[PDB]
Input
Amino acid sequence: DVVMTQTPPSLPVNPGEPASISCRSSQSLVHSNGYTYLHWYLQKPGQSPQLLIYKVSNHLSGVPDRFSGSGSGTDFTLKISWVEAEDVGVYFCSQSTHVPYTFGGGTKLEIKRTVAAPSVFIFPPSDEQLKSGTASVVCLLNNFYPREAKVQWKVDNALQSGNSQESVTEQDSKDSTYSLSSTLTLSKADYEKHKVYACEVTHQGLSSPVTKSFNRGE
Amino acid sequence: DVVMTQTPPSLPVNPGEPASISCRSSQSLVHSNGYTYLHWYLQKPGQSPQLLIYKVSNHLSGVPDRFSGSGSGTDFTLKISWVEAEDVGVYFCSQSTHVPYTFGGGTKLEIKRTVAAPSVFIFPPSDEQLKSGTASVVCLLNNFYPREAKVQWKVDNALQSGNSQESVTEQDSKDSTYSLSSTLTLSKADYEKHKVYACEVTHQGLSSPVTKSFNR
Amino acid sequence: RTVMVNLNIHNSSDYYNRSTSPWNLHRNEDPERYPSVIWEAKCRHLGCINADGNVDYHMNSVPIQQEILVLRREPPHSFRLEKILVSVGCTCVTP
Amino acid sequence: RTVMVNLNIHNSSDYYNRSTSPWNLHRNEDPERYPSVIWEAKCRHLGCINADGNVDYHMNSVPIQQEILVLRREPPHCPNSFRLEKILVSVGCTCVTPI
Amino acid sequence: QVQLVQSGSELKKPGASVKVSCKASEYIFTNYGMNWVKQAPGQGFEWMGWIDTNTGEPTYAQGFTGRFVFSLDTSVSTAYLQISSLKAEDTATYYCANYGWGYFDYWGQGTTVTVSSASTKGPSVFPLAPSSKSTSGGTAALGCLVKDYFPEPVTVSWNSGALTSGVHTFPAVLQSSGLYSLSSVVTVPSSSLGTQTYICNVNHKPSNTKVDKRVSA
Amino acid sequence: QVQLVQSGSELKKPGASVKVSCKASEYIFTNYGMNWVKQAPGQGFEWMGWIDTNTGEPTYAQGFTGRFVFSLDTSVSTAYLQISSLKAEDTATYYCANYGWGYFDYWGQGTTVTVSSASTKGPSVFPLAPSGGTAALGCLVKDYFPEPVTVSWNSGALTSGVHTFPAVLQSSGLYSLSSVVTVPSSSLGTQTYICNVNHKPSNTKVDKRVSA
Output
């Protein structure tokens, strides 16, 4: 299989500024018939993928000229000469010169914003949930930019591994921020065996990591 | 060869009256593919031949329905209904089911007209031509119908043969009439050797043959 | 089901006689088809010619067939693209 | 020269491996042509297999080639538009005597 | 103008079969046919292969030679994908896309196949009670843990839709249990934690469960 | 609306060769190419055969296997009929006709090939002078080769009642025709009638006035 190295994986763009996405192939996409079957597609949030450029630079009627395709052999670029807020989504290339047909990893076009540090909250488990033999500690990172953030859980100072899961919201329609929750799931038995639960957050908006912590039963 | 027996050879038609032409094949024109490649073509006076009907009854985008093709196997017929003046020409069939492709002898469509007798005129040879040593006596039959007409030359009451030729015009586009010129060609001597030159015409419109003549 | 097509097309040997599986060309003419004449092939013998030039009923002449695209004149009441299987020649095979 | 064509083109053999003149099938793929993939025959040997099952080189594998009709997207910018073209293609190989 | 509409979401036990449909609005003339693409969660498009819309011939790709059948019912302009002996690695979103003349032009919206041995369970809803150390006049956080439900989805709302501003409802995560868990949180003025009642309205249609839990300071 | 425009009239001596042309206004897509038809004088159409406008391959009817070559130059959309060892039987009008999908669709105007030992001779013009009612007068054009001769009256201002006859080939192997006009008798006294004969093959131009 011909591998498509598409870059970058995430592309934050101030609205009205340009965007350039690259797809490099592990070998020439020049067909023996002389053409190059390198195509660009976009999947806008909640929508079916759509074609923008085919055979390197060909636009389908309705694709504005702001979307431009360029390249030869193994190096290819999609330029968006100005980005509107509705251009957000995953751009990805396809080569179909070679079988099997393959696909770039994708580039997620998002809206750039000023760095915002998360406000961080820790939630101990409810009395209700404890009567059930299960204990879940939630850590919330609210309204932060950019998305890159690390949450580490510590129980009586012991770094925790494998007992945590987390999801992130899609970029907010109003303030262009991400939010994140991590859950530490422990057995009522293991939870009562320790006192100190701490959530440590690392984001570029913070000069140092912030820790939010609690003592069981307070 | 597949023979195409087309009839009649000539077809005079009163304008607004119908015309019917028939084509006969010496064997079926049914191709193995199921179709019948029998077509009708018209050559209008002084023009390239043109297609009217193909595959027995199929029409060209311009041909009006007044032109109809019918038939099967070895028997076929083209019918022209409201014969106009634009219709004058030679209609002919082609079969191309079989190789070689073959063609009917043709039917000449002419306009029918009330019989009109010919106006007969006789021309003696010019003094100019006589000096040359040959002598030509021309008889004209102008505006007559039908076409069939007979001119008999008679020097000194003596009939003639092999020495005269005749040509006939095409039907006039206006009066639907023919015209004919007969040329009696003699020797300057044989000419001045006789007095009486007469041109006698027999036509359907003549109660009796009419004769024009001169002396000297 | 219709498509626009420019009908301006963009572009011998005696194998039939010299083959261990020789063959003859039968004329297929359809005045309503492009191609009008297709020369199909029929394996002359059920078996193949050996080294000496005699026939071996263990080796067998079989026809090489291929689907080809053809145009047929659309009846008055222009053309239609269709596929026909045709024999282009015979080869010699063993069971 | 642009006519309209209606499309009615909507709808195994080991001879290649059992022939005295056997062949292998090569993929002729032109994403701009209909048909897109034409499997062409490449004669495996310059000669032909003998009864003993060896290649007798005083006989010749030759390819039976037929000229076929194909559609190619044209102009390439326009879809639902095509041009008719003739291509030569190998369909299989037979065994022949030389001279 | 050409639109490819795929079938709806599918939930299945390991060992079962799914047949996904892809109906096109019009007839398409392609030198190829309908192609199928698989996307597992947080994963690339992987090409499964294609079926000639003219011959019916299916071409499958290395990944997908076994339990996958492409087929056509040309009478309805529809294409079908069938997967048999469904394993978990088959949990993914499958897309139908038309390839013709060198490229994909039109794509379906995708169909999601979820393979699970789990059984319908309504969620336990627990309060994420707001910190007693909330800053005076500053901002406080409170929410709902919606835990141990199957399958997706749940809706969450606050004070019956009268609290929309400040709310984050997070994507659900699948626990090793095979059951899902999610969180809904609201950032509210700390001054209000005493004068305003906060109730999360969670609904799990699959289980006809509706729970209205109150989060108390 | 395609038009097949054939070449032009040809005069040739026995033993010679002629190549006739048939150029098309535009390209014709056909399963079968152009066909050729011979029409001897006073006789019917006889099919000579055809050439594939796709392969260039000709096919000759049993009549026409020896001295007959069909050829084609697609560049200028033209087809060609060549005849060698021209004989008398070959004197005829030859027509080009496109054939496709089982029939002939378009025909050329035809080309007349005349085979003759004869030579060019300018024509002699004599008055066919006249003498109530209607009168006739004319011009006898005699001893000319080859065709054609154009006759006009009062320099083309008298077309009404003119009959110019097809010509006759006299044993001399030369041609003679007559042109007559019908005029009112009372007229001869005033109107002056002059026939205009032209034989460009001989650059001969004669204006003869017919006097009572």
Q: What stands out?
A: Chain E touches chain D through nine residues (CB under 8 Å).
